[PDB]
Inverse folding.
């Protein structure tokens, strides 16, 4: 199913008729970082499988819902259960939910992920406000926009110079200073590793020489689709580990360790993004 | 449709029977740089859609013709309307037109493109004679030759050490010196960004550290197919902007600016390539 | 055909019923390096085309057998005729033979390949014990594990920190010292170039700046599938040429030169791996 104007309108048509919510903000949350979706007030849970033209996720299994309601006085829509391209989802399957957000009226998309640290300043449990990226799939002919362009959403050749909104980064840092956890907050450049294998020790060393601060398996596809159709983005990485240190010490990585870091910071991040949503200037 | 010996012979069979032209030179021209195709003498325009086994381009739309005739006393064939891989065309769809050029008797292929400047010496409106490339899709398993090899056209493992003919670069520079615009002409290494998003500021910074002078979304696939079947290549980039400077100054890129640079240099480039065609030693 | 638990069990079911061999070691040999497969004692040759669910190789042609028998008192299984991803084989087609090895009881996989030298210390005819890799397809969303995970074989997110067994590298070096050819043996990092074009001169120069010692078109996919399902790996590159030197001197590469180097070292490598198999501690 192509992520075109007609198909995306058919999904939005069904969603408007079931929720009666016109969302202003969209959110996509990382592994173990979805507690905020459970506190959405006056919420309506819509399974992906019930929405026309939404991608099939029964092979991968696990949760897949669209949740609408209120947070901090603002109306929001949330993807519960993330679509990652290492699962095999196509360019069209990634793009359609974001373009449906657009047709519903979303103007700001907030994103969290788990990622590995490259910069020597990054420790486990730190946060990184993303100010740019290095898109290795995009350079290698696997950009999420490869294919015919859907002119109703954006141009054929998008410029990504301002994909990460400066004002949103400044607002997120300001709130961290008000609650005195700014010592955990950095900024940096995110490298998109297709996955699903973690970055190898020598791949980590190469990324250090290329000026990457952080590496992960998600986020960049959603950022490009949002920037294509004029949605502003804030993206925050939670550092699971420092891969450069782990290479020097021959320390392994695994998803259980990653989830444990997510649990250590889940409540702080939920408090953080709730204040961001409340203070957001909508554009 | 596979770009094999039989299918390519069937397209050449139809073209010979309609044009009565045996071309020696092939040309592929960049965006806004196609004026020379309009001055082809005793010309025959053959729409792609009429040629057996030629790829379907109705989804992307816009022009798609094969034009044959004379330039500077030489017989040439031109692709009017370029096939870019960010549109979604497959390896077989890119390869077939070049191999048809081979079966018609083409021995030299001339190429122009628009590209972003990385080297600090490059300014908007400059030209770069390409002497090598960095093929990020090729490294990432998206090489244009991925698939079964068509032995009638070339070997399984091609060497690209001499894909860009030294003598052609020297001839192109010589003509620029005769008309006193050699101050616009550089040489450098071309990085293949799959597209269709422009190179991000941090991607541009990485390319600077890797010794890339220029980055663009085309050309490398055609160069490899030509080198595979023994066709000599000259490739010239027109610099739309300096992406390293634009990152320092937070200046955006867009296709309208790119086309405006193409218009500023279109007539000079047409004059330049017409003299190249006229003086070419055919091999 | 998906490389899942059921399909792989059906291939192993057929193989057990035809060979009556329970192999402990698997081997995959590079171009021109397959002489050891001819000395397998009490051997049973099983064509790929006769094994249920094995990938179709009639388009590429050439040999495709599974060979079982004894070497050095140990029971082994060998792939005769390698599956390379530049031929167009899918992720599932690469993975199934290795997972069938797993279900037959393989605990150690030994691999040889031909590759180009980047490190200035490497000369034609040298050997490189691989201690890590840089997986350019994997970074670019063409990782061999892209797709749904097959939970019966391994986890969704594998760690590759110890994909190349330290003890096996130490054993291979020890045997080279016992026979006084340790002056030919190095260790280094392997870069995976998707192929099938050889690394370009400027691509070679980039790899030097990134800390790659060796570049080739194979091996990394098999290493990842083996590490996924808990099989230990030793991988050795035979250096066909030094691509950095060849760029400085404008010297070409071709498959005939590569095969000639393979013939120069074939008997030494066969003797080397036969002793490795004999001395292997099985785990
Ligand atoms: N180094 C890492 C570590 C974690 N992750 C993210 O967390 C999950 C896998 O641990 C996956 O959801 C993955 O996106 C990552 O991408 N890269
Ligand atoms: N930085 C740039 C700038 C331009 N281009 C080429 O020009 C058109 C898009 O502007 C496209 O046709 C594209 O090939 C490019 O590839 N890279
Ligand atoms: N520079 C090189 C040289 C050789 N090879 C390997 O050898 C065969 C092609 O020569 C192919 O089988 C290929 O794997 C390579 O991968 N890279």
């Amino acid at each position: 199913v192509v992520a075109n104007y007609e198909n995306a309108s058919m999904a939005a048509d069904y969603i408007k008729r079931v929720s009666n919510v016109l969302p202003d903000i969209g959110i996509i949350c990382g592994s173990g970082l979805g507690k905020l979706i459970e506190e959405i007030e006056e919420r309506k849970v819509i399974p992906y499988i019930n929405i026309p033209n939404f991608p099939k996720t029964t092979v991968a299994g696990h949760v897949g819902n669209l949740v609408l309601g209120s947070v901090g006085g603002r109306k929001i829509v949330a993807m519960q259960g993330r679509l990652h391209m290492y699962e095999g989802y196509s360019n069209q399957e990634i793009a359609l939910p974001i373009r449906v957000m657009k047709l519903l009226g979303v103007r700001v998309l907030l994103i969290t992920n788990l990622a590995g640290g490259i910069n020597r300043k990054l420790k486990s449990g730190d946060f990184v406000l993303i100010k740019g990226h290095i898109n290795f799939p995009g350079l290698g002919l696997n950009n999420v926009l490869v294919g015919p362009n859907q002119d109703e959403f954006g141009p054929r050749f998008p410029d990504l110079s301002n994909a990460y909104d400066r004002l949103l980064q400044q607002l997120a840092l300001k709130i961290a200073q008000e609650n005195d956890f700014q010592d955990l907050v950095h900024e940096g450049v995110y490298a998109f590793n297709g996955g699903p294998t973690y970055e190898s020790p020598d791949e980590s060393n190469m990324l250090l020489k290329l000026g990457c601060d952080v590496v992960g398996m998600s986020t960049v596809p959603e950022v490009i689709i949002a920037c294509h159709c004029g949605i502003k983005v804030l993206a925050v990485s939670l550092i699971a580990n420092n891969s450069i240190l782990d290479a020097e010490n021959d320390v392994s990585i695994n998803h259980e360790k990653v989830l444990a870091v997510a649990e250590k910071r889940a409540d702080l991040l939920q408090m953080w993004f709730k204040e961001i949503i409340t203070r957001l200037p909508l554009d």
Chain A touches chain C at residues 59-60, 85-88, 136-137, 139-142, 193-198, 200-203, 205-206, 209-210, 246-247, 250-255, 258 (CB under 8 Å). The first helix of chain A runs from residue 5 to 19. Residues 1 and 252 of chain A are 40 Å apart (CA to CA). Helices of chain A lie at 5-19, 91-104, 136-139, 166-178, 201-209, 220-228, 243-249, 255-279.
